Design a protein around this ligand. Structure first.
Ligand SMILES: [Mg+2]
Ligand SMILES: [Mg+2]
Ligand SMILES: [Mg+2]
Ligand SMILES: [Mg+2]
Ligand SMILES: [Mg+2]
Ligand SMILES: [Mg+2]
Ligand SMILES: [Mg+2]
Ligand SMILES: [Mg+2]
Ligand SMILES: [Mg+2]
Ligand SMILES: [Mg+2]
Ligand SMILES: [Mg+2]
Ligand SMILES: [Mg+2]
Ligand SMILES: [Mg+2]
Ligand SMILES: [Mg+2]
Ligand SMILES: [Zn+2]
Lengths: 64, 196, 55, 100
RNA sequence: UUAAUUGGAUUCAACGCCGGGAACCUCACCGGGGGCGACGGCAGGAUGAAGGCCAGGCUGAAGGUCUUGCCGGACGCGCCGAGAGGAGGUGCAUGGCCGCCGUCAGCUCGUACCGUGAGGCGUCCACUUAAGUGUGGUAACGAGCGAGACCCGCGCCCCCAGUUGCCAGUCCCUCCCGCUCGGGAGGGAGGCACUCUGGGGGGACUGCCGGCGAUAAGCCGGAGGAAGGGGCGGGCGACGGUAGGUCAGUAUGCCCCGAAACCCCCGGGCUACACGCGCGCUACAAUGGGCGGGACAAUGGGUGCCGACCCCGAAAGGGGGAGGUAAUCCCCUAAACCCGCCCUCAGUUCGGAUCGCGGGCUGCAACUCGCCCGCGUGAAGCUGGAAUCCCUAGUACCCGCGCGUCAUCAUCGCGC
């Protein structure tokens, strides 16, 4: 099953609140921003975080 | 060919290290290093009691050099003795110390707690100690002491944690001691930091 | 002479011509690339020699 | 009038450091050097039974040792030859030089 | 059964297992022959201890012992303690390691609260997941180890690198064909295009679209894509239990032998054979057998070694011997497959067990007890009762090859 991991969600929520006006609904832009704003080194973890952040943006923009 | 050269050197170090570990037990032996120079071989030995290694003004260093050159294949050896860098972060040293403490006659709980307290005081993320043998009776038993953070399964546990093992020879038989320590600078894969 | 009744013949082939350099056992000796070690002794000293279990 | 240098080590990083040092030595002088050629890696693989006795299911260990290699060709210039003759390699790298 | 046929393991989890393919050795068994007591002391000892030898008997053979006399100079098992050594007992005295429950989802802690107490709660309920994996509700609120994350390899693209790897385009020389308009093959220059080798990087995230579910966690179906939902294959096995196996790999307590249960040498045995069982190989034929001819690999290994190339021999083999410490030289022009001819449903041109004669190789030694070759001989077997095993994709079936063991020997293990 594709169950998101706990620390991925935690760090994604932390990043979203710190810089709300920094991420869009585009995967590439979020990927670059996550790369620059943290010390993550695994290319897989970066993609997971960027995907969850994209979902968060599109969800809050809709207003839940 | 070339492979035979690499393997030949690796065996010499293993044999020498085992011999020294068995020989310099009371001096707190903590590893060695071998360097090759055009004049010969520089052999550095790490220990906690360099006086025991030197042995009252030589008479022991000369014997060690002679043994190394004759019994083993070292050419023109030269032995230097130094001090262990981080004695409380080396699992082998702590295991041997606990074994010696047991051989003296201390109850194993006191020895284990003293060792854990010292190691955690010197700034280690986690430690685990396991003692097995005929403790308090003729039916064997195993006990485990633990505190802190410690990885056990996976690649990080292979490359970050330091492990050591030792035997304690008492009157009734042998007692096995295992020690595992995690250094303060170890970082797990899921420890990510936000750049401010 | 009396000491001649204790020396062994210097064999050059067969199971009796090779012993583990660490424990002295005959039999399962690994002869690859010049190693002379038992299958028992090689397992517990392999990491020191630089071998690893990648897969 | 050309020298051939062979490098081999069990650690890739040290090999890269030595190769980069030789490359920079050649760069700081007027001398042509064919790039470091990567030769195939040596793998030494040993498979052993795990248990000391013969009881139970049979399981095996697969130990592996890897040896990396590089090749570098450079023309014999005494001004540049002395520098590479004095560079110090780590103890886990083997170097051999010959003139062709 | 025997002089001995050494020992361990008996459901899964004993029985091509102990890396166990034992001619000597290995060796632990059987027959026989020799040798060994640091260190203390007791008899003894230069008027020479302890020790060693030419020839010849005993002997399987032996200055082992004796006969016969020649050596050497300081210790002394004839005696008492003690010791080395022990594949001798105990895995139900232990350490370390390994199998199984099980790569299953479990095992706990701080404070609070409930119960007189053993204990309980969290760890429960609904949905979901490969997972105590998650989302909501909850006298619980939060943490740790395990799972995941992590490490190695495979498949797609980009940069750098060009030898010992690669040869397409361009030039030169030589030789063949349908006589050369054209088409091939070598060699030299020359190049890094392509393949390959190995460092760095990109790429996939339920990211996009439509449904179900709660609007959450997620699930189902599509687009593009080399790759789609742990992308595929491996490594890593928590707290504990199993008095599970191992003291016959090594370490080690206790008990035993301690001039034999220690150390050497020769010859036997582990290879016996009315019989029961496990795992396999070869067949019972045409979805074939034989003969001649034609095609295409990969992994690994080599100086106590791999050996191209020439000569001799019908074969197995024999005599010289370049190159190779190896991307350079060698092992190394696989088989199943394809084409033509003979056999035509038969115990046969199926099957090749068993035995006779002869020729070889390794080795100090081939009878017990090794492997190879030529001619001859030609057993059971014509598809298998009740039962029962393995396997979901480059997988299963079929076909060969490499390495380990190894002087010689592979119906085996691990890989291709
Ligand atoms: Mg076998
Ligand atoms: Mg045999
Ligand atoms: Mg024998
Ligand atoms: Mg109460
Ligand atoms: Mg309950
Ligand atoms: Mg969990
Ligand atoms: Mg895992
Ligand atoms: Mg047991
Ligand atoms: Mg038992
Ligand atoms: Mg047998
Ligand atoms: Mg038997
Ligand atoms: Mg036939
Ligand atoms: Mg015979
Ligand atoms: Mg028939
Ligand atoms: Zn061994």
């Amino acid at each position: 099953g594709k169950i998101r991991q706990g620390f991925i969600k935690r760090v994604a929520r932390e990043l979203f609140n710190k810089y709300p006006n920094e991420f869009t609904r585009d995967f590439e832009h979020n990927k670059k921003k996550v790369e620059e704003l943290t010390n993550v080194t695994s290319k897989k973890i970066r993609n997971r975080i960027a995907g969850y952040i994209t979902k968060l943006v599109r969800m809050k923009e809709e207003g839940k | 060919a070339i492979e035979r050269y690499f393997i030949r050197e690796a065996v010499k170090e293993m044999l020498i290290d085992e011999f020294l570990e068995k020989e310099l037990r009371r001096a707190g032996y903590g590893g060695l290093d071998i360097k090759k120079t055009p004049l010969g071989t520089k052999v550095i030995i790490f220990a906690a009691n360099p006086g025991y290694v030197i042995g009252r003004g030589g008479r022991r260093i000369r014997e060690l050099t002679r043994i190394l050159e004759r019994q083993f294949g070292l050419e023109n050896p030269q032995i230097d003795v130094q001090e262990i860098k981080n004695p409380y972060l080396n699992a082998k040293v702590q295991a041997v110390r606990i074994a010696q403490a047991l051989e003296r006659g201390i109850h194993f709980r006191r020895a284990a707690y003293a060792a854990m307290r010292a190691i955690m005081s010197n700034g280690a993320r986690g430690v685990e100690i396991r003692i097995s043998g005929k403790l308090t009776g003729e039916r064997a038993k195993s006990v485990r002491f633990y505190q802190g953070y410690l990885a056990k399964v996976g690649n990080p546990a292979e490359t970050l944690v330091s492990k050591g093992y030792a035997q304690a020879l008492l009157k009734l038989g042998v007692i096995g001691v295992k020690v595992a320590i995690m250094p303060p600078d170890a970082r797990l894969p899921d420890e990510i930091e936000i750049i401010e | 002479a009396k000491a001649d009744y204790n020396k062994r013949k210097p064999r050059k082939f067969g199971k009796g011509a090779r012993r583990c350099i660490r424990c002295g056992q005959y039999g399962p000796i690994i002869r690859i690339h010049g190693l002379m070690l038992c299958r028992h002794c090689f397992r517990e000293v392999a990491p020191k020699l630089g071998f690893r279990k990648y897969e | 009038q050309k020298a051939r240098i062979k490098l081999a080590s069990t650690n890739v990083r040290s090999l890269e450091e030595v190769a980069n040092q030789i490359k920079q030595i050649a760069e700081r002088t007027g001398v042509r050097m064919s790039g470091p050629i990567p030769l195939p890696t040596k793998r030494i693989r040993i498979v052993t039974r795990k248990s000391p006795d013969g009881e139970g299911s049979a399981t095996f260990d697969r130990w592996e040792l890897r040896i990396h290699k590089r090749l570098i060709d450079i023309e014999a210039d005494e001004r540049a030859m002395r520098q590479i003759m004095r560079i110090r390699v780590p103890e886990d790298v083997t170097i051999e030089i010959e003139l062709i």
